[PDB]
């Protein structure tokens, strides 16, 4: 079966992709985000939803996982969803400035604030994307993110988490944490994925070179045809 | 029906994407090249080919089109093809250095020379990807590309061309140039595509913003579901 990575293992793979393999951050974040959008459109196809176009709130955190979310949002728009973004803490870098301007020009709105009650999220948004924290998160959830996570915990609509459910320990999980209905593991799942109790677990990031895969014995499943996602279990 | 762009309209679309929309070169080239690999895999699926895995020669020119071929070849490898690259003139810019290193660490070999005779290409490679010149190219074919084009025009195996069949005037085509079996038009087809004679015409580069599509009256077709290509005609 597929290998579930430790936090160290994942940080080592991420290091090689940008070092030995000379991938650019731009690049792999674009493929990551596309997988994310693709898994979401496959698990929650626009046809299956009661609103048209179906609405989605994408919550983007302060780092790279956030960047994935912004990429994910605009492909989701291309796929026929009507996304909305909350992005409260934005790094002051071209990468993220660009990603913001692209979304702004796709007419995707960035909210001024997180809606404060879960009921109000539920009412406006048919799905929530958790793009807050990723694989290199180390455990100190500060405001406004704790607040956001606590609103998410009370939701009735599904949550789709990118790479790891935000607020989970990357290896141990968090039973009192958010419980996403969809998890998109990027490149390979992390050990916290073994505590995943949602219906949908997709693997994404179809860019792992065979030699990187052999070395770390990932045992990736075979992606069908030209798909950038693979549904695990 | 879909709009066929003049070279001028294509350059203005392209410039808007990198200027107002603030996409980065990397992002769009990655998506463009993935579209290419996806269209090939759809037109010439691995099961439909005599050898296993199926072999493909990718010929990359000295600018952005060649960039697309380098991305394309790496995705084709992930999709189960066995590509070989010929890349005789390589700009000294980190964009291309990177894309070359990524290909080499995918273990895709680079040829030192073009096979001199059409028959030898035919015997070694089941498909040839023409990523030599793209939409900016202005009439002038110098070495080694004239000679490579001369080899390509005598092939029996199919040629897949990225954006524009290399050696064709970007609007007027070229009665005596190469005649590809597959054309992958990126973003929107160009006027020269009305002179296309092959079996397969795909549209790729599924990143055009609606507002830009409204602006240039592209009348883009509906990509199905989460696909990054659409079969035209
Ligand atoms: C090893 C590894 C890399 N990545 C890469 C892919 C994306 O470019 C970025 C995630 O934001 O880092 C992961 O997301 N998760 C991982 O476990
Ligand atoms: C408008 C336009 C853009 N592009 C974009 C996509 C790629 O990122 C880059 C080089 O092919 O330019 C085309 O290839 N062809 C076009 O006609």
Swiss-Prot record, chains A, B:
Cofactor note: Binds 1 potassium ion per subunit.
Top-rank lineage group of the source organism: Eukaryota
Listed EC numbers: 5.1.99.6
N6-succinyllysine: residues carrying this PTM: 89
Claim: Phosphoprotein is one of the keywords in the record: yes
Entry GO CC: cell body; cilium; cytosol; extracellular space; mitochondrion; nucleus
GO BP annotations listed: lipid transport; membrane raft distribution; metabolite repair; negative regulation of angiogenesis; nicotinamide nucleotide metabolic process; regulation of cholesterol efflux; sprouting angiogenesis
Post-translational modification: Undergoes physiological phosphorylation during sperm capacitation, downstream to PKA activation.
MF terms (GO), sorted A to Z: identical protein binding; metal ion binding; NAD(P)HX epimerase activity; nucleotide binding
Tissue occurrence: Detected in testis and sperm (at protein level). Expressed at high levels in heart, liver, kidney, and testis.
Record key words, sorted: Isomerase, Lipid transport, Metal-binding, Mitochondrion, NAD, NADP, Nucleotide-binding, Phosphoprotein, Potassium, Secreted, Transit peptide, Transport
Cofactor needs: K(+)
Binding site for K(+): 65, 130, 166
Annotated catalysed reactions: (6R)-NADHX = (6S)-NADHX; (6R)-NADPHX = (6S)-NADPHX
Binding site for (6S)-NADPHX: 64-68, 134-140, 163
Ranges where the YjeF N-terminal domain occurs: 10-220
Reported function: Catalyzes the epimerization of the S- and R-forms of NAD(P)HX, a damaged form of NAD(P)H that is a result of enzymatic or heat-dependent hydration. This is a prerequisite for the S-specific NAD(P)H-hydrate dehydratase to allow the repair of both epimers of NAD(P)HX. Accelerates cholesterol efflux from endothelial cells to high-density lipoprotein (HDL) and thereby regulates angiogenesis.
Protein family membership: Belongs to the NnrE/AIBP family.
Quaternary data: Homodimer. Interacts with APOA1 and APOA2.
Full protein name: NAD(P)H-hydrate epimerase
Annotated source species: Mus musculus
Gene designation: Naxe
């Amino acid at each position: 079966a597929v290998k579930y990575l430790s936090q160290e293992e994942a940080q080592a793979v991420d290091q090689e992709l940008f070092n030995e393999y000379q991938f650019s951050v731009d690049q792999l974040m674009e493929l990551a985000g596309l997988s994310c959008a693709t898994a979401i459109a496959k698990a929650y196809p626009p046809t299956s939803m009661s609103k048209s176009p179906p609405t989605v709130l994408v919550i983007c955190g302060p780092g790279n996982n956030g960047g994935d979310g912004l990429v994910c949002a605009r492909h989701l728009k291309l796929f026929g969803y009507q996304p909305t973004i909350y992005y409260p803490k934005r790094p002051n870098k071209p990468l993220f400035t660009g990603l913001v301007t692209q979304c702004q020009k796709m007419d995707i709105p960035f909210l001024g604030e997180m809606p404060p009650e879960p009921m109000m999220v539920d009412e406006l948004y048919e799905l929530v994307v958790d793009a807050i924290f990723g694989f290199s998160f180390k455990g100190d959830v500060r405001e406004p993110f704790h607040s956001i996570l606590s609103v998410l915990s009370g939701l009735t609509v599904p949550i789709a988490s990118i790479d790891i459910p935000s607020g989970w320990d990357v290896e141990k999980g968090n039973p009192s944490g958010i419980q996403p209905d969809l998890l998109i593991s990027l490149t390979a799942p992390k050990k916290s994925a073994t505590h995943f109790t949602g219906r949908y677990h997709y693997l994404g990031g179809r860019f792992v070179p065979p030699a990187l895969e052999k070395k770390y014995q990932l045992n990736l499943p075979s992606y069908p045809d030209t798909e950038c996602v693979y549904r695990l279990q």
